[PDB]
Each structure stands twice: as structure tokens, then as C-alpha cells.
Write a protein that binds this ligand. Sequence first.
Ligand SMILES: [Zn+2]
Ligand SMILES: [Zn+2]
Ligand SMILES: [Zn+2]
Lengths: 176, 170, 176
Amino acid sequence: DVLHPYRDLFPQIGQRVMIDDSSVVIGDVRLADDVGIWPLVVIRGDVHYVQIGARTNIQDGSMLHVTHKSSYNPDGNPLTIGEDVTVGHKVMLHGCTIGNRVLVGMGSILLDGAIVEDDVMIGAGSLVPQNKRLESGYLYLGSPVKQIRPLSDEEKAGLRYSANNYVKWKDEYLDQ
Amino acid sequence: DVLHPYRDLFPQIGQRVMIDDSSVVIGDVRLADDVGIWPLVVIRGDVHYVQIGARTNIQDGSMLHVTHKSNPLTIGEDVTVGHKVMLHGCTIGNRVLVGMGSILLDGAIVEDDVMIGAGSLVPQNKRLESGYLYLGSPVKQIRPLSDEEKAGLRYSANNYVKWKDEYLDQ
Amino acid sequence: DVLHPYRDLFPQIGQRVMIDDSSVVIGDVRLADDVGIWPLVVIRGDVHYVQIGARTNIQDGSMLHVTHKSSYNPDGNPLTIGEDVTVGHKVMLHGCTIGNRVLVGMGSILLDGAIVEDDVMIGAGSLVPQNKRLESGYLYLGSPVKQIRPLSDEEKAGLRYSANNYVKWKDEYLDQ
Ligand SMILES: [Zn+2]
Ligand SMILES: [Zn+2]
Ligand SMILES: [Zn+2]
């Protein structure tokens, strides 16, 4: 009872996907293999689609939506998330684009049109302005975010570690 | 069951009101016609009442409460309360857009035709002058809204009323 | 059904504890007497435990989790909260330690390793960095927080009243 339709739009689920019973997934939401949706999360893909790549976790209390229809976006815009992405607790993602191996710090807000490239870390409580592009391989922090410094190889490997740890984490629940 | 009581208080609902099955509305909460309460929203009107005007949307993940007595929450018509907004014992006029993730504190007063940027914080008792854009934590008055932006405030509410009806028809 | 087990770990509940039907409590979560868990709250004590002291309120929309397992903390770390603590609406607590008689302003984020001593007030929308220690008897505000000023005797008394009032409000809901 966690998946809901919007007109004739319904979530498409891959293999080993975990969606907490307390969460709400509405409309055109594509969840790739090993995606884990934790407690009290809302993902709404009504005016456009939401695409979440393999081995990506959407942590507790996050809210994911697409860009609404307006003069700037007559048909709105989708929310796209790559593979091995760690979306922290209470993160707000709105019609943005996130690449692969990205860690979005808990409590952050990513606005419409924002584009986050691969291997990027966003500190907790950050705000990414509309249409802002976050260059690959850097640490961003602040409200609004500022490019702080490039990530070390160890840090970049940690991005993969985070995604893998959460894949094992959701499997432990699908196992219970 | 999305409506719940508090003592002798229970929510009063107008016409064509949508309340997502995952939301929680408690106590003296008054929702006017065409109000739309989206997923995972909590509106608690126990310590005091919560009044929401016609054609106003309360988006996903918002949390609405009143001042802790030791002040009611009043929202006007055609108001767009963004996703994850925290409203606490404040007063909001008509045609106001509260940017997603914002926090409006006790005693705050927002006049008509105002836009608050996403992730902003409006301090206790702060009054936001009509016709301006405010943003920041705490908010700062940035600039007056253009006529197109004001029309945008109306469109935002209009669009969400249609959006609400879309779900009700299902 | 608000209590859920994580493997053979299950919440331990004291006397007169209120847990809203819309909330989610998972795993090793220990709630002392008179604790009140309000609507849409998630408390997850899976990799480690969450310990909440007596007469403490966890307000609507809060998200409580423990420090994740990592090369730094192989078995993770617990989230510990003292007695007479007021955790404001939408607060994010993550593997930190909070003393007694503390008020955490709504919308705040407290990160891993943070330590909040007794009789402290944190303003709404604040962010407490990892491992930061907040000295007893002061007001902290900001993102990241800064020590603003000492709390007045009136304010220190208010911390007690805040907790007391929420215990009363908790009971009103329990009796109905
Ligand atoms: Zn939206
Ligand atoms: Zn409150
Ligand atoms: Zn966590």
C-alpha cells in the first residue's frame, strides 16, 4: 500500500527494491535495482517523472518532487538521480539532476534545475540554488552552497562505501 | 481516518477539500473550500486553533502548529505553503508563497502578495511587508515583486487547486 | 503498530509513554517514563541504540537516528538524550548526546558526536557540527551554531516548564 497511481502513471520497480511501509510513492517513479526508500519518505512523480538509479538510498524523511508547470517550465521537469547516490535524512530534492556517486548531506535542499555532477559531496544543511551546477569531484557546503575544495581519492571511495553500506542495510530489512 | 480530536475540538472542513490519507489533522483546524493538504503533513490545532483560507495548498511534509502557551495559526486565501515548510503560530495573508523548507516562527506576520525564498527563516514577531521578495536565514527584504511575479502567486494557487481536484477525481 | 523490531531488537517502553499512531519506532529504542513521541516522527535504532530520558518530548516531524557503521565507528554509535528535554518540531538528531533540560529549537540539525550539556537552548533552524560541545547554561544559534549568551534564570526555569507542559499535553492525548 506504498505505491499509488496518478492517472495512468504508476511506479516501476526493479529488483531488490525496499520501500518502507510508512512511505508514499506516487505516480511515474522509476526505481532501479537495489534502491532503498526509508521511513516517512514521499516521492511524487505526477506532472513529470522521477528516476532513481541503481543502489541509491533515499533516507528517512526525504521529500522528492518534480518541477511544477509554470511559465518557466510549461511542461515541468523531472527529478533524475543516478546510481550509488546517498540521499541523506530529511533531504528535499526538487526537479534537479544528480549524477552517480553523490552524497547529499542530511537536511539539504536541492532546487529546480540544479545539476550535480558525479563524485560530489554536499554537506548537511546545505541549499543548492535553482539551476546551479555542482562540478564533479568537489565538496560543496553552505546555504547557498559554495565550492569548498576537491574531494580526495579516499573521500570519493567513501561515496561508493556509503551506497554499498546502505544496499546491505536495506537487504537486512528485506530479510528481517 | 486523517481527522482527529483534541478534547472537545475537531476539524471543520469546507467544500472540495483534499487531505492525503498519509496526513494528520488534529483538533481545532478550520479548512476553507478548495484547501489541499498533501502527503505526510501534520496540522495540530490543540493549544490554539489553525485557520486556513480558501484555495490554499499545504504541500508535502509541512508541519503546522500554534504557539506553545506557557497564538493561533492563521493563513489566508490563495496561499502556497511549500514542501517541508514549518509554520508556527504565525499569520499569513492572501496570495503568499512560502518557499519549500522555510521556517516561520511565532508571532510572525506576512502581508499579502509576498514571496519567501526556499530555506528561509522568519524570526518571531517579524512583519514582512506586502509586495516583496524575502529570503535568507533570517530573511532579508530583497526587492519588490514584479507584476508577473504577483500573477505567478495567483497561478501557483490556481494550479494547485486544479492539482488537488486531479487527485480527488481519483 | 508503531513499534517495529530490527532483527531481535525491539523498543523498550517505560510508564505513561505516548507514541503517535503515525510515527515509526524501529529497533533498540529505549523510552523512559513520560516520554512523548508526537506525529510523523521516525526513531531508528538499528545499528546502535537510541536512549531517551524521562519526561522528554520528541515533537512532530523529528527524525532520530544513530551514527552509521564506518571505518571510524565499526559498530556505530548511539543517540543519547537526557531527561526533561524538549526536542522541537522537525528536529534532526544524529548520533549525538544531549544532556538534561535542553531545548532544541524546531528545524535544527544536530550531527554525530555533538555533545549538548545540561540547561542549554538551541535556537530554531540551527546546525550543530559533528563533535561540537555546547557549554551548559548558554544559548546557541546559527548554522553552524555560535555561543550567543548565557541563559537568564527565567529562561533556565523555562526549560523545565517546557518539558513539564509537554508531559501534561502527552497525558491529555493518552487519557482520550
Ligand atoms: Zn513540488
Ligand atoms: Zn509547536
Ligand atoms: Zn542516519
